[PDB]
Amino acid sequence: GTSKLKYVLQDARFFLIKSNNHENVSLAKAKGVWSTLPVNEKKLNLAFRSARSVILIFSVRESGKFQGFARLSSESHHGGSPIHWVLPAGMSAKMLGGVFKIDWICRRELPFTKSAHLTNPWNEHKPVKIGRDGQEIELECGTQLCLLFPPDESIDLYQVIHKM
Ligand SMILES: CNc1ncnc2c1ncn2C1CC1
């Protein structure tokens, strides 16, 4: 069903995450972590304190799809085992130093063709697939986007709910 999912998404905030490569999203799915550039790191830390759920919706550049979505379980922290991110040209390891812990809600993909009816008011009403890394997605659009993903039967949102 969709009732626990809707409960998790109630009054949530949503952010588009754009990865330049598949490798880093695969690592994030395996290890439950994400890192972003300092500008977005500060925004996500502010949002984590402001809302009961902050949802990251991932899309790999040139894939034509979203690869899933996850909820922040923590603000960024430094000083763990260095995650072996594949580094885009011009991006340093220090730039990705802040590590957020995340709980995946759906690890399944959604092609952009399925979200063509959803526009984001916080990005000039452009289709929700359009946006830079860190673009906030307004509540209604983000909720409807998350509800379009195929159900991920491998995830139990009970423990996710128990973190809110
Ligand atoms: C581990 N984090 C990341 N991996 C790959 N690309 C990323 C990224 N964060 C932002 N980007 C885009 C270049 C803007």
From Swiss-Prot:
Domain annotation YTH: ranges: 12-149
Residues with the Phosphoserine modification: S81, S92
What happens on changing G68I?
Abolishes RNA-binding and ability to influence alternative splice site selection
Changing W104D: reported impact?
Does not affect ability to influence alternative splice site selection
Annotated effect of mutating R132F: Reduced binding affinity for N6-methyladenosine (m6A)-containing RNAs by 9-fold
How is the protein altered post-translationally, as described in the entry? Tyrosine phosphorylated.
The effect of W85D is: Does not affect ability to influence alternative splice site selection
**Result, substituting N123D:** Does not affect ability to influence alternative splice site selection
Q: Where in the cell is it found?
A: Nucleus; Nucleus speckle
- Outcome following mutation: R132A: Reduced binding affinity for N6-methyladenosine (m6A)-containing RNAs by 100-fold
Which positions bind RNA? K18, S19, N20, W34, S35, W85, D133
Q: What is the effect of changing R132D?
A: Does not affect ability to influence alternative splice site selection
Tell me, how does this one assemble? Interacts with SRSF1. Interacts with SRSF2. Interacts with SRSF3. Interacts with SRSF7. Interacts with SRSF10. Interacts with CPSF6. Interacts with KHDRBS1/SAM68. Interacts with TRA2B. Interacts with KHDRBS3. Interacts with EMD. Interacts with RBMX. Interacts with ZCCHC8.
> What does the entry's free-text domain comment contain?
The YTH domain mediates RNA-binding.
Describe its function: Regulator of alternative splicing that specifically recognizes and binds N6-methyladenosine (m6A)-containing RNAs. M6A is a modification present at internal sites of mRNAs and some non-coding RNAs and plays a role in the efficiency of mRNA splicing, processing and stability. Acts as a key regulator of exon-inclusion or exon-skipping during alternative splicing via interaction with mRNA splicing factors SRSF3 and SRSF10.
State the protein's name. Answer: YTH domain-containing protein 1
Q: Which organism is it from?
A: Homo sapiens
Q: Which gene encodes it?
A: YTHDC1
